[PDB]
Amino acid sequence: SAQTIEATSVKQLADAGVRVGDTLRISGTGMCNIRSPFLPFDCSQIIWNDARSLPLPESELVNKATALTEAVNRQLHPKPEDESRVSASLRSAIQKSGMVLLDDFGDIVLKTADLCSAKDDCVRLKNALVNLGKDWDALVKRANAGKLDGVNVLLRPVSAESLDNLVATSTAPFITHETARAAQSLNSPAPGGFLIVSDEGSDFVDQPWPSASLYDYPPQEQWNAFQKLAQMLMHTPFNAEGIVTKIFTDANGTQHIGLHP
Numbered sequence: 001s002a003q004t005i006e007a008t009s010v011k012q013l014a015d016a017g018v019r020v021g022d023t024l025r026i027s028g029t030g031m032c033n034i035r036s037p038f039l040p041f042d043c044s045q046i047i048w049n050d051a052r053s054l055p056l057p058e059s060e061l062v063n064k065a066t067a068l069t070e071a072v073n074r075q076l077h078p079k080p081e082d083e084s085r086v087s088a089s090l091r092s093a094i095q096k097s098g099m100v101l102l103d104d105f106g107d108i109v110l111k112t113a114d115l116c117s118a119k120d121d122c123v124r125l126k127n128a129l130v131n132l133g134k135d136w137d138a139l140v141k142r143a144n145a146g147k148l149d150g151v152n153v154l155l156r157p158v159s160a161e162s163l164d165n166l167v168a169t170s171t172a173p174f175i176t177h178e179t180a181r182a183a184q185s186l187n188s189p190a191p192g193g194f195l196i197v198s199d200e201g202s203d204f205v206d207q208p209w210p211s212a213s214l215y216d217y218p219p220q221e222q223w224n225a226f227q228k229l230a231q232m233l234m235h236t237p238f239n240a241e242g243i244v245t246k247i248f249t250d251a252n253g254t255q256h257i258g259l260h261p
Helices: 010-016 060-076 088-096 105-115 123-131 136-145 157-185 219-233
Strands: 004-007 023-034 041-048 100-102 153-155 194-198 236-249 255-260
Touching: 004 010, 010 023, 023 194, 041 219, 041 236, 060 100, 060 105, 060 157, 060 219, 088 100, 100 157, 105 123, 105 136, 123 136, 123 157, 153 157, 157 219, 194 236
Parallel strands: 004 023, 194 255
Antiparallel strands: 023 041, 023 236, 041 194, 100 153, 236 255
16 A cells, blocks of 8 residues: 655645655755755755745844944045045045044944944943043943044054954854844744655755855855845755655644655
């Protein structure tokens, strides 16, 4: 009593009533499980469900982080095309000698506290942000009303590039917090359908393995790489052949199938 089952849609497999011993040849569109080539996804288990997919996650944090990053970088590396109530030829001499003129010190400070909300958050940058112009829980106050818009703070070259690195170093932990968190948010399996699983841990999809591993990407690249990973892998083509070695049904209604070839 060993059936042999071709299925290209979920309801065909539900119909065929698979028992251990059967041979499945299975193909269609699915999602890679969460909890490895495509870490955080594990493409040796495929979620096969007709309930359509979760949206890409968002993060207010990431938006706050890559916005402060840019605010400092656009003031540390101003482009020839730039407004300035500062003299033009004076600007060219600041750049010849390696120095840095903060247009809007006030914007740097606000967008820092906006992001490092907690008092323990990024304290070293907040320190370096106060010498350059007090105490942190007061610079924010002076910046809140809007008073360091008229201060001009000029930076000697190593403090500039050191503040550069301090901003890069502080925003990076946030963007990986949120990337890990967002991947867990997608671990929210719909009831029913199947979890098709390879016994050998082989991958079920046919996608080119990403070269750089996700956790090993740069900081201001991690959010976007995840998104492309998630958007392709939550709707990827897949196929699976083999001999059913286990078959059971979830408290959540989902049928788990382990396949060996």
